[PDB]
Amino acid sequence: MRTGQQYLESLRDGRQVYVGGELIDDVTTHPKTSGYAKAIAEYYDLHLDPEHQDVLTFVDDDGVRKSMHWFLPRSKADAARRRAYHEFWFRHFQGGIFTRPPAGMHVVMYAQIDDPEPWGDNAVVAGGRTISFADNIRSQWQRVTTDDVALSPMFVDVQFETPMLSIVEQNDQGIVVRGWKAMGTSLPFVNELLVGNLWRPGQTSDQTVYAIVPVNTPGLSLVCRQSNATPDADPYDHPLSTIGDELDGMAYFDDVFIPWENVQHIGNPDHAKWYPQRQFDWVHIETQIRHAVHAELIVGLALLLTNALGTNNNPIVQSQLADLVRFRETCKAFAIAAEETGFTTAGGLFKPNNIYVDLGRAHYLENIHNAVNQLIEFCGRGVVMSPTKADFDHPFLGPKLEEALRGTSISARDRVSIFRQISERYLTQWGARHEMFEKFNGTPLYLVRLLTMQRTEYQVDGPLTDLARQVLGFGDTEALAARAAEVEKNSNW
Amino acid sequence: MRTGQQYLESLRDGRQVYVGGELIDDVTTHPKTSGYAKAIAEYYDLHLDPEHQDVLTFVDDDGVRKSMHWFLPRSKADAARRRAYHEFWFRHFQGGIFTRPPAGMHVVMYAQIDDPEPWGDNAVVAGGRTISFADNIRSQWQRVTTDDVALSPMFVDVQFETPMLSIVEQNDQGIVVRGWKAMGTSLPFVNELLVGNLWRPGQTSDQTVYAIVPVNTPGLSLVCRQSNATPDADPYDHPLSTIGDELDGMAYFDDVFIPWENVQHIGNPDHAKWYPQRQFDWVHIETQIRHAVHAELIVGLALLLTNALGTNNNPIVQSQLADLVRFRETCKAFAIAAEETGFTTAGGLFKPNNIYVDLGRAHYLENIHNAVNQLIEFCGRGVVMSPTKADFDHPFLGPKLEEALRGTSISARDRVSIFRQISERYLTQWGARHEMFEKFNGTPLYLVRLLTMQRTEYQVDGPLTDLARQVLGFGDTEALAARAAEVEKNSNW
Amino acid sequence: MRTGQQYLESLRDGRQVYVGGELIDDVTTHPKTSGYAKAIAEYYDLHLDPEHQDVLTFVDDDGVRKSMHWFLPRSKADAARRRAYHEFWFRHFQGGIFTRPPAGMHVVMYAQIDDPEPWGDNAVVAGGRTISFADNIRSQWQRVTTDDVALSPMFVDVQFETPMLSIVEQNDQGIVVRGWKAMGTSLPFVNELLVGNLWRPGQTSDQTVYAIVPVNTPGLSLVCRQSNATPDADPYDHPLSTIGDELDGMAYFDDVFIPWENVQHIGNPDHAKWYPQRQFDWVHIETQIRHAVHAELIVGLALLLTNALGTNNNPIVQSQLADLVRFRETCKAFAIAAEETGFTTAGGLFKPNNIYVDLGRAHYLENIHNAVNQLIEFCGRGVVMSPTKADFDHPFLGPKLEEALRGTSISARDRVSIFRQISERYLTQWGARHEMFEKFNGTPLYLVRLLTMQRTEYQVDGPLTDLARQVLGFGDTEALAARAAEVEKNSNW
Amino acid sequence: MRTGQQYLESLRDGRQVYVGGELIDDVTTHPKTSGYAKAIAEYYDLHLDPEHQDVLTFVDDDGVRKSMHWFLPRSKADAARRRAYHEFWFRHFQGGIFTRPPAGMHVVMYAQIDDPEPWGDNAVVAGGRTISFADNIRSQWQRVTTDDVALSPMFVDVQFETPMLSIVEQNDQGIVVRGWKAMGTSLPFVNELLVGNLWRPGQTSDQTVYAIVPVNTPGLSLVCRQSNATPDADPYDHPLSTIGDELDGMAYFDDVFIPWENVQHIGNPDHAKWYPQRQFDWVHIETQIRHAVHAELIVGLALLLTNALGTNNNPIVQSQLADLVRFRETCKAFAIAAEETGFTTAGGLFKPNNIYVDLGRAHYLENIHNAVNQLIEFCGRGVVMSPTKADFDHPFLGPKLEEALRGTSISARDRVSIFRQISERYLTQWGARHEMFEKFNGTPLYLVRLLTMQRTEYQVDGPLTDLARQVLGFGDTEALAARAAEVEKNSNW
C-alpha cells in the first residue's frame, strides 16, 4: 500500500500533460492540478490509517494487507463490504464531487482477472507470434496490486487510416499504436492507462486493442479540459472548487510502443462486443451506489435549506421534499435489489444483478435534472445574489448584511453558505462537469433503454410475457403463427 | 380448511345485501353476484388440492393444516413464502383483477394478534365493566383460523349524533352501535366484518370501535355499488366481466348489537392514531406486491400487442417498452428492498420495511395512469372498433373480417382478443373500478407524501441530513440557532 | 334546411346496419341507435329555430338561407363566426360528448370545393373515358347544400387483391369497388359517405378512390361497434349514456357501384399524398376548438367538485386547479393564434394556420390523460362507490344516505351527481370511446411530431435556425460544408 | 436621444459600486464591468443609426424623435411595434443574454404615467405637507424621456427598525430613507433607480416608498454579485462571457435624502397591493416575448447540433426536436393571444391580456429546464471535453484534433463552437445567472399558480364554471346551498 508522498512522487515522471492547452511541468505543484493531486494523496494516506483499517483494507490470498480498491468479492457479504467502501469514499468526497479515485476506476479490471482465458483464446495476432495474454492479465494483476499502482480506463473512441487508436506495427518485442482515445478521467493523476474498445460498427482488427500503458510512455500526450480549480479563491465563496478539479481528457498516441507483457488482447472485433460490457458492469455498480449518495446529499441540503428559509411547513414544499426523499429511496432500493439478487460468475466472482443496476441508473439519469431543479427552486433569489465573504467582512455594510440576510434561527453567513454550496455544485462550470460526467458515464439512458429490450428476459417469447399469454390463452410466437397460417389455408381470400 | 361448497353455503344466511339498489335474495345465485361467489369458492377448493399444498398451506402451532391466509411470518424466509402466496393469487386472478380474496383481506388482523395487550390496555369502557379485549383477540383468532371464516375490513368513515358509526348503548352483554361504515370490499362474499377506525380530527370516544361483526347480524345492511358483472355476455367479447365483479360498498348499522367477546377495543381516539396504521401496513405490503404483478401484466400485454401489430422494431416503441419494463422492475425492486430490510416486531412478527413498501406504492400510484395510457397508445384505433364474436361469425362478412384484420403471424381473432383484454381492463366500468380501487386503497399518494416527512428518519435533525451537515460544517438545529443568537447578541441592530 | 322529422325519415331507407353484430331494422326506433338519431334530429330543428338564426344560419351566394355547416369562410371574421358555431355545438352537446354531428363532419369537403380542378387534373382513368371530376365536385356541393344532406367521411384504410377498398371494374356508367373502409363515425346516422384515401406506401392506382356513396347503396354494409347507449337507465345514474351513443364503424363494399357523377377522383396515389391532408386540416381546426371546450368543462367540474368537497382551499389543490386552468388557456391560445395568423387559399378560403392548430392538438393529446387523471384524483372514493337513485329513494336507508353523504353547502344527491358526471365521461365504456376517439382522430401525437420536422419552416436550413446561425457566425449547410471540405484539402490526414 | 459616449460619461459620476466585494473606481474601464457598459453604449448608438430608425425610434407628442424604450402603445398595432422592438433587442443580444437593457427596464414606468392620480390620491404624508405626486410623475416622465436617462427598478424587499428600506425623516425639502433594497438588475449601468414595494404582510406606512433616486446619491451603495465577465479570455473559448456580464445586486441606503419632486408615493401599504402589479404586468409582457425568442434559439441550436452530429434522422431525436419546436410555438402562441385579446386602460394605454402573458410565462417556467436538458442530451460527451482554441492551434496535435473531431460536413472547430455556445449559456456560472434570473424574475411559477385562482374569471361562481353548471343543471353556489339547507329542514337527522 503506497503513501500519499509515494503517490505524489510517482506523478513527477516526465508525463506530457495539457490542461486547457497549457503544458503542465509538474502536476503536483501547478495550481491547475495540485489540489486534486493532494486529494488523491490523502486518499492513499487514509488507507494506511489504523482507524479505518476495517472498512478500507483487507488481507489478500498471498497474505499481504491491501486496499479494498483491489478486493474481488466472492459472496453477497463481500459485495456489501465493497458497497460500504464505495460509500466511505462518496461521503469523504462530499456526496461524490470526485467520481474517479482509484476505488472507482480500478473496478474495470475485476472482470478481466476473473475470466482471463477468453482474452487470449479470442485474440488475433499477426505472423504466427503466440502471446500468453491470460498470463499477462494474471501478472498485470499481481504487479498492480502489490505495487498499488493507480490506473484509469480509456475505452471510448472518436466517432468517425482512421484517427482512432490502431495497431500500425507488430514485432517480437510488442506492438506500436497510433491515434486517439476519446475520453478518460483523472488521466494526469494516474500511473498507467487501461486502454480498450467497446464495439462499434466497422471496427477493424487493428482497432481492437486492450493494454496497460504507462502515462509517461514516449509519444503519449494527455489532452485534458481546462481546470475549473480555484486554489486561490476564498473557501467561503467557493467551498468545493478550492479543493480541486478531477480533470477529464483525450489522449494522443504517437507511435507509442507497448510490450507484449502489457497487452491483454488484440485483433478480434467480436471480443469487443461481449467482454468490455462485463467490465463496465462493475463501473455501473459503483456509479449506481454514488447516485444514491448524491440523492441523499440533495435531500439533505433541501431539508436544511427549506428549514433555514422557513418554508418546510408549506404543504407544497413538504410534497416536493417527499418526492426528493422518494428519489433517494428509489436509488437505494435498486442498489439493495441488485446486491440481493446477484450471483457468482464461473470464476467465483459475486456480481450484483445488472438488471437492477442499470434500471436504477436509468431512474437516476431520467430524473436527476428534475431533483436538482427542484432544489434550486427552493432557494429563490438567494442564488442570484448571495454575498461574498469580502462583502460580509466590510466594516460598515458587512454587519448590515448579516442583519439583513439572517433568519430566525440561522445567521446570514451560515444560510448563505447553503446557497453557495448549492451554487457551486449545480450552477458553476466546476459543478456542471459533475452532472455532465454522470450523464454520459458509461451507458447513457437512451442506450439503457435500447439494451433493455435486447436482453433475453424481455423478449416477446421470454418469461415476462408468460402471465400475459396465460391470460390470453396463447402459446408462443410459433404456436400463434401456426394458428394464423392454418386459418389462411382453411379459407379462400 | 373449508370447501368451496361450505363457503357458498355460508353465504346463504339471510344477509341483507343491496347491489345497485336491488335487494339480493341469494348472493350465490343472483346474476349480479354469483360469478364472484364462484371464484372465491374455487379459491377455497384450490387450497384443499394436494397439487398446491406446498405454496398454499402450512401446519400451525396447534398441529392443524391451514391456509396461508392465516400464516403469520416469523422470518425473512416466511415473508418470502407469503410473497409467493400473494403472487400465486394475483396470477391466478389474471394480474389481480380481484384485489380482495381472503388472502388480501385477512392480513389486516396480523398486527392485532401479534400485539393484543395494548388493545385492552388502551380501552375506555363505561360503568366499571372490565372486558378482556386481549383475550377476545386471541380467541377470535383461534375461531376464525380453525373454522376458516372469511373476513373483510371496514375502517373508513364518512366525512362529516354524527352519521358515523358510534356506540349508543353499553350493557353487560355487549354494545349497540348505530350509523355507517363508509367503504369496504367483498362485503357480500364474507362471513364477518372487521370494523375499525383510522383517526380523524374530532373523533369521539363513542366513535372508536374495533369489533368482529357477522354479516347477517340483525340491523346490518350492506349497500353495495352496481354490479358490472356480465354473466350472459360472450367470453370472447368480455373475457373478464364474464367471470364476476368484486363489489365494494357501504354498510348501515341500525342499532346493531355486538357481544363483548367480539369487541377488540372501544373508547380511545388516540389508540386509533397508532395501531390501525400498523394493521394497514400489511395490506400495503400485499398491495405493493400486486402492483409489481400488474406492471408485469402490462408490459407483457404490450410486448404481445406491439409484436402482433408489427411496431416493436420502431425505436420509439422500443423506448417506451423499455420504460414499461423499468416501471415493472421499479415495483419489484421496492418489494425486494422491503423484504430484505424488514425486522421482527416485539411479538416476533417479521415485517417488511414499510418505507420501501410505501415508497414503492407511491411510485406505482404516480405513474400507473401513464403506463396504462402508453399501453393504449400502442393499440391505435383497434381499441375504438374491434369486432364482436358475432361479427366474426357472420357467414359472409365474418370471413371478410378475419381477412381484413389479420396480421402476418396472428389471426384476426387472436389479435382482436388482445385489444379486448386491454379494453376490458382499462376502458370499461368493470375495469375502471380496478384502477379506482388501486388509487384510493389505503394511503393514497398525496398522503404517502405528507406522512413521509412526518417520519423520524426524514426530519431536519434526523440522519438523512448528516451528510449535508458534514459538508456544510454544521452542528444540529440547536447548534446553528445558538451561533445565530450569539451573532445577534454580539452586535447592535 | 331540413327538419328533424325529414332527417329521421331519411334514415329509414333500407340501409344495412350492424351494431355489436345485430342487424338493425330501423335506426330511428332501435334502442341501440335511437337516442343519437333523436339528438341529430334536434340538431336540425335548432337550425330552423328563429332564436338561433344569427349564430346557426347564413344566406348563401344563390340567395338561399342555409346552415353554417355549409359556410365556407372568406375572412378572419368568417372564421371567427365558424368558431362560434362549433362552440355552440360543443356546448349544446355538453363539452362535446358527440364529436361528429354534420357541423364536424362536413368540414372535410371545404378544401375540395375550394380547389376542385386538381382533383380532375390529377386523375388516372381507364380506357380513354374522360370524366368531369371538377364539375362533379361543384354539382355535388350544389346538391348537398341545397338538399341539406348529411355526410360522413371514411378515409382510413385497413393495414395490410387486398382487402382494402379498390376499383374492380370501370365502365361507361361509373365504377365498381370492393373491400373495406376501416373507420368512420356516425355511419348509421348519415345519408351518404365521403370515401377517400390518405397515402400509405404501396397504395396502387385502383386503391385510390374519392367518391360520394349513399349509405343504402346495394352491397354496402355498415359494421359498427356495440352501442353503449342506455335508453332505459335512470338519468340520475347515467346522465349521458341515456342520451345516446355516436357509433363508429367499418364498412364493407360488396361490388358496390358508384356512378361517375359521384366520383371526385380516382387512380393517382400521389394525389393522395397532398390533397386529403388539406381536407383533414379543417377537421383538425374543428377538433382543436373542441379540445379547448372540453378543457373548459374539465376545469369547471373540478372547481365545482373541490368546492363541494371542501378541498379547494388546500394549496396543493389550488395548485393543481391552476394547472387545469393553464391547460384550458393553452388550448384556447393555440386556437386564437391559429385564427389570427391564418391566410386565404388561392380559391379565397380563409384558413387558420395549421401550425398552431396541430401544435395545439399535440398539447391536448399529450396532457389530456393527465388532466382527466387529476380530476379523478380530486374525487377520492366517492367515485368507487356513489349511490344510485334507487339507493337514495329507499324509504329507510335513503334518507340515511342523504344524511351521511351531504356536504356543508350541497345535498348528497347534488354532490353525487358530480361524481356520476365524472364517472360517466371518464370511467365507463360509453365515455372511454370519447377519449379514444380524441386520441386517434386524424393525425395522432406521434405523427404530429414527425410531420412537424418535415415542414419547411423547421428544416435545418429553414428560418428557425437563422438566429442560431447568426449567433454562431455560420452560413447555411452549404457554406459550412464548404469550409470543412477546404480544411480537409488544405491538410494531409 | 443620447449617444453611447454620453451614456458612458454619465456612469463616471462618483457612484459607489461593489462587485464581488471590490469597490469599482470606474465602471466604464474596470475589467469586471466594462464589456457590459460598452454593450449598452452600443445600444444607445444603434438608436441614433438611420438604418434602424423605423423599428427603433418614434416621434412623440411634443414633436421630438425619441427611442421606443419611451413609447407608450395606444393600439394593438402599437403593441405589435413594441413587440418587434423587444425582438430586435433579444436578437441583437443573442437570444437575450442580457435581459435588462433600458428597453426591458423602462417598461415598469408605463403604468405610472398612464394613471398617476391614484399615486397621489392614495398617499399618506406626515405633518400636513401636501405633495403633488401626480405632477411629480408627469414631470419625471418629461425629464427622463427628454434627457434619455437610464433607469432600473428595485422593488423587492429583504424577507424579515427593520433592515428593509423605510422613511426615517420627513421634512419640507423631502424624505430621508434608510435600509436595503433586496434586488435589482443593471444597477452599476443606470443613472437612476426606480425604488418601490410589492405588498407583503406586515408592511408599514414608513416602508411604503416609491421614488426616483440617482445612482450617485450620497449614502447609496450598490452591492453587486461577482462579475463572471471574462474580458481576457479567447472568444472562441468563451463567446459570450467575453462580451460582458449584466450584474445584479442589492443596494444600501444610508440616510439617503430624496427631494419631494422625486417621490411618486409614500405611506399607504394598500396602494402597494394593486398598483405595482400593474407595473410588473409590462415587465412580464417583455419577458414573455423574450421566452419565445430564447426557445427559438434553443431549437435552432438543436437543429444545427443534431445535424452536425448526424443524429437528426434518428426518430427519437426527431421526436424530441419536434417537442422543442412545440415549446417555441407554445410561447409564441401565448404572446399572440395576449396581444390579440388586449384592451385599452382608462388612460388609453393598449395593454396585452395578462392572462395569456402570465400563463405563457408559466409554460416557459415549468418546462425550460427540460428543454435545456434535452439540448444538452443531444451533445453527448462533446460537452464534457471540447478543445480550447489553444489546443487546436498546437503545431502537432492541433491538426490531429481537427482531424479527429471533424464531421462529414462540418470542421472540428465549427462543430466544437456549437458545443461551446451551449456550454457557455447552460453550463457556466456566467450562463447560470441567465437561467436563474428568468426563474425568479417577477412572479415565479408557484405564485402564478396561486394568483391564477385568485382571479375573478376563475372563481367557483365565475364564468369558467358556467358550462359545467349547465351540464349538471345547477344554479350558483347560493342556489345549491339553498337546496341543501332545505333538504336538511325537510327531514330529521
From Swiss-Prot, chains A, B, C, D:
It comes from the Bacteria. The keyword Flavoprotein applies. Induction: By 4-NP. It catalyses: 4-nitrophenol + NADH + O2 + H(+) = 4-nitrocatechol + NAD(+) + H2O; 4-nitrocatechol + NADPH + O2 = 2-hydroxy-1,4-benzoquinone + nitrite + NADP(+) + H2O; 4-nitrocatechol + NADH + O2 = 2-hydroxy-1,4-benzoquinone + nitrite + NAD(+) + H2O. Inhibited by methimazole. FAD binds at residues 153-155, 185, 452-455. Keywords: Aromatic hydrocarbons catabolism, FAD, Flavoprotein, Monooxygenase, NAD, Oxidoreductase. One of its GO terms (biological process) is catabolic process. Disruption phenotype: Cells lacking this gene completely lose the ability to grow on 4-NP, 4-NCA, and hydroxyquinol. Its EC number is 1.14.13.166, 1.14.13.29. The 4-NP/4-NCA monooxygenase is composed of an oxygenase component NpcA and a reductase component NpcB. PANTHER family: 4-HYDROXYPHENYLACETATE 3-MONOOXYGENASE-RELATED. Involved in the degradation of para-nitrophenol (4-NP). Catalyzes both the initial hydroxylation of 4-NP to produce 4-nitrocatechol (4-NCA) and the subsequent oxidative release of the nitro group from 4-NCA to produce 2-hydroxy-1,4-benzoquinone. It can also use 4-nitroresorcinol as substrate with a rate of nitrite release similar to that observed with the two physiological substrates, 4-PN and 4-NCA. Belongs to the FADH(2)-utilizing monooxygenase family. This is 4-nitrophenol 4-monooxygenase/4-nitrocatechol 2-monooxygenase, oxygenase component. The gene is npcA.
